Amino acid sequence: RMGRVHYPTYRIVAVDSRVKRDGKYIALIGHLNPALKENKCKIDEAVALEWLNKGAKPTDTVRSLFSQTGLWKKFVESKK
Amino acid sequence: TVDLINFRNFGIMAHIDAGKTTTSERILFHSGRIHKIGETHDGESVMDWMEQEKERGITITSAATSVSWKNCSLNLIDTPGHVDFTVEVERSLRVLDGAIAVLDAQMGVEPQTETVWRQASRYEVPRIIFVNKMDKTGANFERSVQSIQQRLGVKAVPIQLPIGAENDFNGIIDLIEEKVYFFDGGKEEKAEEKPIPDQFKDQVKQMRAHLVEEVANFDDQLMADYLEGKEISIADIKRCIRKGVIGCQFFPVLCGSAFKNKGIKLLLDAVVDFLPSPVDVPQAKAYGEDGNEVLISASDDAPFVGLAFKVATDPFVGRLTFVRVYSGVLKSGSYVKNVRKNKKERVSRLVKMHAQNRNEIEEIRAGDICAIIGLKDTTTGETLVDDKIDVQLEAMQFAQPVISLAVEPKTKADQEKMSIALSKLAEEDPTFKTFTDPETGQTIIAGMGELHLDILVDRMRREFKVEVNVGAPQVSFRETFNKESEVEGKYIKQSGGRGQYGHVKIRFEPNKDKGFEFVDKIVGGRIPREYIKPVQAGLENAMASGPLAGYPMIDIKATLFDGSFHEVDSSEMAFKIAASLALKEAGKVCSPVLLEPIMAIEVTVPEQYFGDTMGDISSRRGLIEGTEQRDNVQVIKAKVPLKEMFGYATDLRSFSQGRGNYVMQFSHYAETPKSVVNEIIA
Amino acid sequence: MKYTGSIFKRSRRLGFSLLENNKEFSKGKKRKTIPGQHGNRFRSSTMSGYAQQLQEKQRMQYMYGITDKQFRRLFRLVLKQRGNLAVNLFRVLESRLDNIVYRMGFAPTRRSARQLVNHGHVLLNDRTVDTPSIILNPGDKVRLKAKTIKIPIVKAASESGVVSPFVETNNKTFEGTYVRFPERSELPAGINESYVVEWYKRL
Amino acid sequence: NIKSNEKRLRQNIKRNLNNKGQKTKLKTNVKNFHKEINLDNLGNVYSQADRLARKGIISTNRARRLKSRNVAVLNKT
RNA sequence: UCUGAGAGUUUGAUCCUGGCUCAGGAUUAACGCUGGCGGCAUGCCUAAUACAUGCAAGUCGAUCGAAAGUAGUAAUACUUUAGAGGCGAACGGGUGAGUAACACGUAUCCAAUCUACCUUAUAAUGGGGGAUAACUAGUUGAAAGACUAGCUAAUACCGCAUAAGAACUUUGGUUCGAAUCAAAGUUGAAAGGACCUGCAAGGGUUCGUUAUUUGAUGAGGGUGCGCCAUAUCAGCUAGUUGGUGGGGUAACGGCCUACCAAGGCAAUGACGUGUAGCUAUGCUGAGAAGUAGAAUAGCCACAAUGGGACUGAGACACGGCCCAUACUCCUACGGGAGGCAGCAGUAGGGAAUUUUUCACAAUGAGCGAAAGCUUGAUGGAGCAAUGCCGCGUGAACGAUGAAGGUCUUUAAGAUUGUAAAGUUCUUUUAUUUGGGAAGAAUGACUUUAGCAGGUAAUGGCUAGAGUUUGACUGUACCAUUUUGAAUAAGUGACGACUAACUAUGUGCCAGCAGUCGCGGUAAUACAUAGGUCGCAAGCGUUAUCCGGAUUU
């Protein structure tokens, strides 16, 4: 994360949940300020689809935004 | 605070060579009679080193001695161990609520117990009396109970009666209760309750008929009962004696032997029942820094005031500031203020010590003692505050390091390391003075006596790892000269590229009561006025050296008579150098002499050391004339050379058993006799 | 310093009134002489290009009370825009809140405007401002809800209104608004802004 | 030290003794094959490689390389 | 078009060759004087110098037997685990001694590699054995422990059935050291747990297992370029330069071994030497560049020191191990125990670089369907004018200019100074009262609607549910929220450069000093009083990087 004290920021990244943050990234997907909740983000869901095809599970709480992206409507139910 | 009625704190005040280590150890053991962990038997199993009474008595435990007795927490402290150097004693006294004065039993003189009692009675603080040894030769009960009144006359009431005389010591005849036999020759464990012996029933009754009578100065109903002969309740008379001792009306006396450990449980019982609480002690107030600066007391509830009185360095966590919090409640992790230095000090952690152990208490209430890790800038003699308000300080320290000794650095680096040691050793007690003389050069440091200088050396070499040579004090002389003469100065010289010349004619005349003085005798224009002033300076710098030992020559009247200003070869500094030559030549001709410092010393002694001081002054040195007869004492003033003070501080004190005093004031410089002329020269 | 302290003293050596003329013109007399007990004849013994540059810069910040660091801040802000930087900076020189309030007929002095602003009597677009250095922009509404009836100063300024095209104001309803960027001709011309921007390259 | 390292020691010491036994018996099979060449010990090594490479005891690459080398030198016999 | 300002300085004097000084910035900045505060960070660079204490990386009982305790008449349910078994531990953080070279960065090569936990993709998920852990009892001592004998569990260990598929072998079929297919030879596959359902049979969910194919990740290996100075450092080199076989690493490889030889490099500077963590980049200039590689981020080296091994996918492992070294501590003295370059804190040093502070609130990481646990990371908060930004200490009017003082040199005037007095007003901040956050638009949680192969049903999933999560925080700030000018300004220079001088003292002395230089008898150069001016809660001083200096 970055920003200022009393001024958090965290650019959302589809990063390996087993490798530390604040490093080299295959692809940064979105950003969000958790201080004032208004849900501003620059999600892509294009290369994120490939990342999820090859695992690459993002950090813990990204799944909630995954619900907003509606990938569950197009990722988990894509074999029937 | 919480339960200030029980936070009764006391100090261990023991006489010199009266079992200080022994008495202190027994007080720790009896205070250590808390069976929660085994501290009773743990203290019973202690056998420590025997080098010095005060030193071992201090090093056996920690200065902070937190214990409990059956309802109340007591903080016993023994920081003072010395020839009874005043500052530590009075600082502990202001820290403590009450104290026990230990009497001497090897002899009957006890010359320093009277001094600590003077200091204690000076502050109106309550005290109690207890003879250290009832088993030592010369420890006569009658001797003590008569000497107390003869020397002091404080109406001390002897309460309990012993059983035996220094060999048959086997118990106590209790006054408040029935007799208590002590068969233990040491390591007190049990007390044998027995009825009062028949042959001493009357021995009680008389004293009983006095004891209630001794507390008859409090109420009229007690006197009515005495007239009726009706017995007064033991609790009533116990509370009456408590009021008397806390009010300093009288003071109880108990018996026992430290080496035998008899009857100290009775002392503890008396301490709990009759010694005061902070609510029961008077309010010794402090002083601020504004001009009137105090109309206030501690108030003991939540203004935090606590005197910073001692710091010791634990290697693990750095400094440790021991403090008795007089008022308020304080936590850790908070910044306290020091207004004497105007600085913030973070309380890293709090700690309490019982014998040598740490107990981390996160909160300290008023009326207790503690130590703080953190506070790396505060020194002793200050008062701690946390309310951002000016500090109130109560300080009436008595500093009498009448002897001083010169400590010789082996190197300038040794000088620097000894100054570092001085910085370390001045934070504990800055009463010692240090001077670096501009002429004699050697560093003079003041001390109380042989033991004081010895312990300073011990801290220097062992505690501080500082190795410095030790010497003798240095304050040397002044110079002057004999009958007048007149010579001339001719300096025709050059050093650097051209010619130089000068020549003057001056008169070298002594002036017994006046310093450098100039009188001109230029009437034929031999010296222009421009050269009148520089030549004077040439004199003022020329006297600085003497041909005997090199001290400056004073008490001289100079009269310039003649001179010669030539062409460009002449210059003012050439005349100054010629005048310097004339001054030195005339000083060599006129047989210079020396003057020694002379101090005016006044000694006031009741009767004891009249002939002793007479013979000491006559044998050593000094100017004397007979007697002064003051109201009930003998007063002698001597104008004596300052060298004669060397060892005099202990020559008088040793002959006076530590009961000597004087005032040292510089009088004047006086002519040195031929013996002094032979001694000092190389 | 946030304030020059004595402001007539500033016009003493400068010889220029920060007001129209009435600063050191009507207080008993007109004291436009330079200060100093060492005072004597001085006509061409203290003026130079460096000295006149200092004089212009000094009067420039005296008119606005800008501190050095804020002065460099404003310099960088006018660097952020292009064109003739001197005249653009001068347009930004009016973007002070207290200067506008003085020019809006809401304060007889910019000093009074500053001390009202710090007191909290001003409302800048639903946001009370205690810092009087905020940058003006066109289309800003202000209010004086309740801390104006007890102030005679603001009313006295309101009756002595100021006419300006670059701002609009209803002084009888305590309303002000920044309309457009100011014009150079409406402002004193004795100041030369070029020499100062030449003087500001020293970082 | 810490308790977790103690538990890891108490486990991996015995697991390492077991692995040492397996490796030494594989070594013994390799020895017996080095003495003389036959199909029986070839099958023995075939089995042992699968016994050990199944877990982390023996890496797949090492087992494959050694069996390939042994069968290659067998191909001429 | 991005984009460029100098000044003084020898001498009778003039420039020139050419040095110097500062005017300007920056700085982990330090120091002095002082100093309310907001917000933004940062806050050992000295001694990888030595350290008390605590956390510092542990988790899973629905993996396992059993133990302890509660309830229950018992069975059993429940609470915890002494332990085993599974996984995390190699993450991460910190340091820069070492290392002047594949090390950084960079472009590509791995016809020569590997890479649990997570992607695809299928085959199934058995038959047993035999053991110990824990415990019990004994032996040695205060105890830690250690030793001895008996009983067993495990998705533990080891054989046994088949191996879908692969891999090896052989034959046929491919490609500019390659890759792909077919047949046959051989080998070795799992372990069960919980739940729902089912009288049962058995079926299902879910976890896990085995082998298989495929992502990604990370590591290793190949080079080119870029990555200090030193020739008052010219020979180095025998595993050294290559070849054959073998061992060997995840692969190639003298990496190593046996044999065979004697080359290989180096004047375009090896080797030796000292100086060094590298980069993106911080700052200085318009730039070529210099400055240093702050913090952060990526990469590499280290974990008291030298080796050695240990399992594990992954380490020679901050906080795993043995030896040896060196230290420290305890020992009731026989023996043991350990390593803050982790968080701090502590000792020394310096001019100096801070809290053993709080919650795991959020984020993250780990363990576990699940709940739940760890988390000195993390986020905060404390302190510091350390930098940055921002604000006050009043304001409207107000005098031939209050009083005093200063100069003028008794005289007026100016002067301090709208500063003052005076009237009026105000309150961000000082301070009472109530409001007052988002931060959690996450995460848990079961029933519903619906989806979904099954269906006997729980469960797999998406849309709403609240009991759910705040240290920060009744916080900032705000309704004259109580009152109130009340709660507050210094610093340097004043001969010139350099916008800033009068009075007094003073005598090359006292002293200033960035330079030119002043002061030896009324000094606008020193020291004081007053005054002037410039910056300001910062101003003065020092060091060092640069611009100026294009002065290699």
Swiss-Prot record, chain B:
It comes from Mycoplasma pneumoniae (strain ATCC 29342 / M129 / Subtype 1). GO terms for biological process: ribosome disassembly. It is found in: Cytoplasm. Gene3D superfamilies: 3.30.230.10, 3.30.70.240, Elongation Factor G (Translational Gtpase), domain 3, P-loop containing nucleotide triphosphate hydrolases, Translation factors. It holds the Pfam family EFG_C. Keywords: Cytoplasm, Elongation factor, GTP-binding, Nucleotide-binding, Protein biosynthesis. It comes from the Bacteria. This is Elongation factor G. The keyword Transferase does not apply. The keyword Nucleotidyltransferase does not apply. GTP binds at residues 14-21, 78-82, 132-135. The gene is fusA. SUPFAM superfamilies: EF-G C-terminal domain-like, P-loop containing nucleoside triphosphate hydrolases, Ribosomal protein S5 domain 2-like, Translation proteins. One of its GO terms (cellular component) is cytoplasm. Transmembrane segments: none annotated. Catalyzes the GTP-dependent ribosomal translocation step during translation elongation. During this step, the ribosome changes from the pre-translocational (PRE) to the post-translocational (POST) state as the newly formed A-site-bound peptidyl-tRNA and P-site-bound deacylated tRNA move to the P and E sites, respectively. Catalyzes the coordinated movement of the two tRNA molecules, the mRNA and conformational changes in the ribosome. Its main location: cytoplasm. Belongs to the TRAFAC class translation factor GTPase superfamily. Classic translation factor GTPase family. EF-G/EF-2 subfamily. Residues 5-279 form the tr-type G domain.
Curated annotation (Swiss-Prot), chain C:
GO terms for molecular function: rRNA binding; structural constituent of ribosome. Belongs to the universal ribosomal protein uS4 family. The gene is rpsD. Keywords: Ribonucleoprotein, Ribosomal protein, RNA-binding, rRNA-binding. GO terms for cellular component: small ribosomal subunit. Residues 95-156 form the S4 RNA-binding domain. This is Small ribosomal subunit protein uS4. One of the primary rRNA binding proteins, it binds directly to 16S rRNA where it nucleates assembly of the body of the 30S subunit. Transmembrane segments: none annotated. GO terms for biological process: ribosomal small subunit biogenesis; translation. Part of the 30S ribosomal subunit. Contacts protein S5. The interaction surface between S4 and S5 is involved in control of translational fidelity. The lineage of its organism: Bacteria, Bacillati, Mycoplasmatota, Mycoplasmoidales, Mycoplasmoidaceae.
Swiss-Prot record, chain D:
Keywords: Ribonucleoprotein, Ribosomal protein, RNA-binding, rRNA-binding. One of its GO terms (molecular function) is rRNA binding. GO terms for biological process: translation. GO terms for cellular component: ribonucleoprotein complex; ribosome. Gene3D superfamilies: Ribosomal protein S20. Belongs to the bacterial ribosomal protein bS20 family. This is Small ribosomal subunit protein bS20. It comes from Mycoplasma pneumoniae (strain ATCC 29342 / M129 / Subtype 1) (Mycoplasmoides pneumoniae).
